[PDB]
Amino acid sequence: RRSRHCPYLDTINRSVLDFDFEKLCSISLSHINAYACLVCGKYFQGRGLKSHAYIHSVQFSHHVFLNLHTLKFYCLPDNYEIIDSSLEDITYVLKPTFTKQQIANLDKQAKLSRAYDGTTYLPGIVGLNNIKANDYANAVLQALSNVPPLRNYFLEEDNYKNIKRPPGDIMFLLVQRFGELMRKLWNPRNFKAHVSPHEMLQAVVLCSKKTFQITKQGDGVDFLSWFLNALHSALGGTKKKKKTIVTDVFQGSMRIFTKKLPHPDLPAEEKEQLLHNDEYQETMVESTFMYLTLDLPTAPLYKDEKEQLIIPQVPLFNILAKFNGITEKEYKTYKENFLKRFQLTKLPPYLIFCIKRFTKNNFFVEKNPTIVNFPITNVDLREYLSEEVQAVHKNTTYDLIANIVHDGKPSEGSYRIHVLHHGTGKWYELQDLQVTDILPQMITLSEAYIQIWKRR
């Protein structure tokens, strides 16, 4: 009855509310009935006489709390509900919710949003805090965002909330906290221009079993592969559901033509006789790929007269030569050599390149400094497909939308990500917490490590 007339509403200050972390009572550590005080921004246990929230109210004279799980306000100690429309932004920031029209119009937003503090930004183009060694995870997650289909799927909790999971399954923390993080990143009315991946990375370390920690930085490609596989498995409910969103978006199919070389140290007579053996003949081991592995040519090891800059360079199509039915890569396992051909069969709408930079030589890990000279706005992969598949495939022109770059030595490395902002066509370079504007022509001058292209 006194609701809509609480005289303490002015006490709230949105400069201290930070809903980016665990929701547990700050005195008892319980997850049950958590209430956040809107005057100081701390969590206590909920409601009722002798409770921590009640005692905090009567102790500090902080007389306004929010049920973190119900999104309802209350005024303590005399607990009655509070109803006021000016408080809706706090609830929205606590639990962003995107309606279907909003997700449909998400990409066509040419007007900057403004946070509570005087900071303009764009949804999706938002920095991620950097705990000690986190930049690789930040870059990978930023790249995974900006993928309209996956992003749109994860922006609605109802999509994945009902699927089954075995009893002792910790691998669903990944999916649900990823949905939370996606919604936070694409929230258009934040209180700040940056987000904290603390919870997502805690879930990541827990599920990976201390692989991919946050005090030590791991390989971006390894993290991406593990994350995609984990998401697919977790979304496959109590089985290997053959088609999840990850499979629908990223997974394509290739045809591998492996031919076991007879032997290097044999006479020609025996070598050519072994051809009829059928063991050293071309096979077809068609399989699936989440991401293509492109291998840069070895560094020239000597400078030349042309391109006097000691930096080598390759065209994109030269390294894409592999994955056409002509070239042959040379695999060498112990006692055996293979000539592997490749032939793309099913191309996914969003194609991932994982260019292999770091290679372990006999003594240490070396970073290939070659720069791939590629166009950004158009590439036709039609030729790299069999004519048996070209008829099926209608559209095959791709455009780069995300590019993860690694800088520095293999040990003291760092990661940054060039992202195309849809709606507009501007390219932004996100480092862990800094957002620079990069010109379209300067993306190709970096050591492109990972890339995500859109099929149109």
Binding site: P264, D265, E330, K332, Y334, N337
Partner: peptide, 30 residues
């Protein structure tokens, strides 16, 4: 692996070259 194991591929390809080139190799004196 072993060193000759690593160089087996290059040795095999080296097999190809012709005797005409074999005796025409220059010397570092230049």
């Amino acid at each position: 692996p072993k060193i000759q194991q690593q160089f087996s591929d290059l040795k095999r390809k080296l097999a190809e070259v012709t005797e005409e080139e074999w005796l025409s190799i220059p010397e570092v004196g230049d």
